[PDB]
Structure 1
Amino acid sequence: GSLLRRAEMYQDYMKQVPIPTNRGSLIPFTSWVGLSISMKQLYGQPLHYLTNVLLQRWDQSRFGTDSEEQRLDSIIHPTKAEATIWLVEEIHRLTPSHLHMALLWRSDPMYHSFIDPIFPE
């Protein structure tokens, strides 16, 4: 039971934040974490713990390559880029239980660093 009441409030909140249906034009970006900052600023909504943690791991997964430096938007186009993160986020606003998050949270000592603050109205 530890973490539950916080993981309950946090998942009962995010499930309520609607995924935006009207989209803007292509957002240049150079990391997945960078891209998603551009989306919360522009659309004014938080992304879930699970979306911010998977995007740190997409970015981390690039280190170590042999190729020379290449902007990520030369690889993944900003149009499906954005779409991704709007699809990953929906799964996350709907499907996980709050017992899951408390679980994960009890195992990640930095979990609050992947939770967004309160956004404006």
Structure 2
Amino acid sequence: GSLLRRAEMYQDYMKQVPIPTNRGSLIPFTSWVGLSISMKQLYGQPLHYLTNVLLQRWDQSRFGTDSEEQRLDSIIHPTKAEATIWLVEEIHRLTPSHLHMALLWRSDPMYHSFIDPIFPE
């Protein structure tokens, strides 16, 4: 039963945050985490634990490349990138159980580092 109270409160909160229907202009970016910070600044909403973990994994995945350094937004267009993040965020708001979240957090000693603070409102 470890972490069940906080997982339930967390998922109950995130499932109720609406995905913005009105979008801004394209956001230049050089990392997925960077793009997510821009989105949090501009739209003033948190992103889900599962989104923050996924974006960090996408950034980590680029390391070790044989290619020369290249801006991420020269590979994935910012409009598509932001759309991707809102799509995965909607999945993570609407589908996972709080039991599943508690199970992940039991195995992730740093889980709190992927949970956003409360935003104004």
Per the shorter chain, which TM-score range? over 0.9
Rounded to whole Å, the distance in 1 between the matches of 2:49 and 2:79 is 23
Rounded to whole Å, the distance in 2 between the matches of 1:72 and 1:96 is 29
Query: Deviation at 1:80?
Result: 0.5
CA offset digits 1:4-52 (Å, max 9, x no partner):
0000000000000000000001000100000010001000000000000
In the alignment, structure 1 residue 35 sits paired with structure 2 residue 27: no
Q: Which secondary structure state, in structure 1, belongs to the residue aligned with residue 79 of structure 2?
A: helix
Rounded to whole Å, the distance in 2 between the matches of 1:86 and 1:110 is 24
Q: Which secondary structure state, in structure 2, belongs to the residue aligned with residue 103 of structure 1?
A: helix
Q: Which residues of structure 2 form unaligned runs of 5+?
A: none
Rounded to whole Å, the distance in 1 between the matches of 2:120 and 2:6 is 21
Greater than 2 Å deviation, 4+ residue runs: none
Tell me the residue number matched to 2:68: 68
**What is the TM-score when the length of structure 2 is the normalising length?**
0.99
Aligned-CA RMSD value: 0.3
Query: Deviation at 1:98?
Result: 0.2
Rounded to whole Å, the distance in 2 between the matches of 1:4 and 1:94 is 18
**What is the TM-score when the length of structure 1 is the normalising length?**
0.99
CA offset digits 1:59-105 (Å, max 9, x no partner):
00000000000000000000100000000000000000000000000
Tell me the residue number matched to 1:14: 14
Q: Which residues of structure 1 form unaligned runs of 5+?
A: none
Aligned length: 121
Query: Deviation at 1:55?
Result: 0.3
Rounded to whole Å, the distance in 2 between the matches of 1:4 and 1:16 is 19
Query: Deviation at 1:107?
Result: 0.2
Q: Which secondary structure state, in structure 2, belongs to the residue aligned with residue 41 of structure 1?
A: helix
